[PDB]
Amino acid sequence: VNKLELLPAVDVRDGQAVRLVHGVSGSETSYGSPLEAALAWQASGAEWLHLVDLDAAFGTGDNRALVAEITGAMDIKVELSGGIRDDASLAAALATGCTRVNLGTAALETPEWAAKAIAEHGDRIAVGLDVRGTTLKGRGWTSEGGDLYETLARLDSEGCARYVVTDIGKDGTLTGPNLELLKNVCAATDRPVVASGGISSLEDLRALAALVPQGVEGAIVGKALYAKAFTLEEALKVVSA
């Protein structure tokens, strides 16, 4: 039985490492250099970096050169996300040499483009699902309501390799992950699921580790690390049990 993969996050806005609450632009708390942050996670033993360009996500310019620099400084695997919604932004992300990228709003807004990207790049693509209840959310996209399982079924049939599932209501809140959401997404797809949002404690990581057999492959950890709820060293030890 594989151990839960940990993906410490680095989110970049205006050249700084930041964390958001509920993914809302303007809720940024800042923590200094995102390059220094990434290197610190790597030094502590991270096998993955989850790297996000929030300016690209929000349509307020981008941090492309810095994201490339950070990715290039990593000897470990890198998952890159943020505003990947057309050929050029996808090409820019892939040119960083990252291990895989995440598509988010593109899967909702331009499903044919996303399906083509999956067909052409295979498991270099994962799709981020930002969830409230059973409703998927996207930047500049308004949902019809309750489309989580329809969308999951469509993406499965298009050959999507992997899903990053974020409970928006938990993101950046330190109130704990939505285990019930995660269990049911795992139940609905045979593809690996990466958990995101709300991790607040080592006990939360033990709970997520217990879901590896059900299909939780990994966990993205943001604010708990920056706000020092636990160290990455403690997190890596706990999931090695």
3-state secondary structure 113-164: HHHHHHHHHHHHEEEEEEEECCEECECCECCCCCCHHHHHHHHHHCCCCCEE
Q: How many domains does the chain have?
A: 1
Q: Give yes or no for a contact between 100 and 125, defined as CB atoms under 8 angstroms apart.
A: yes
Gaps in the chain (C–N > 2.5 Å) come after which residues?
A: none
Q: Which long-range contacts (CB under 8 A, 24 or more apart) does 92-95 make?
A: 92/64, 93/67, 94/121, 94/124, 95/68
Q: Give yes or no for a contact between 139 and 104, defined as CB atoms under 8 angstroms apart.
A: yes
Does the annotation count 156 as an active-site position? no
Q: Which residues contact 173 (CB under 8 A, 6 or more apart)?
A: 21, 22, 198, 223
Tell me, what CATH number does 168's domain have?
A: 3.20.20.70
Q: How far apart are CA 40 and CA 49, in angstroms?
A: 11
Q: How far apart are CA 181 and CA 226, in angstroms?
A: 25
Q: Which helix (H) or strand (E) holds 94?
A: helix 87-94
Q: How far apart are CA 149 and CA 132, in angstroms?
A: 13
Structural domain including 84 reads: 1-241
Residue carrying the six token digits 């033990």: 206
Residue 33 in tokens: 């250099």
The method recorded for this entry reads X-ray
CA angle 176/181/187 to nearest 5° reads: 135
Candidate list 11, 53, 171, 204, residue with the active-site label: 11
Beta bridge partners of 49: 78
Q: How far apart are CA 111 and CA 141, in angstroms?
A: 13
Q: Which of 157, 145, 38 is nearest to 98 (CA)?
A: 38
How distant, in Å, are the alpha carbons of 9, 24, 48, 60, 172 from that of 225? 9, 19, 14, 26, 11
Candidate list 53, 55, 130, 167, residue with the active-site label: 130
Residue carrying the six token digits 């052409």: 120
Q: Do the strands 135-136 and 125-132 form a parallel or antiparallel pair, or are they unpaired? A: antiparallel
Other Cβ atoms within 10 Å of 60 Cβ, number: 12
Residue 154 in tokens: 């469509």
Amino acid, single-letter form, for residue 147: D
Does the annotation count 53 as an active-site position? no
Q: How far apart are CA 126 and CA 103, in angstroms?
A: 6
SS3 182: helix
DSSP letter at 189 equals: -
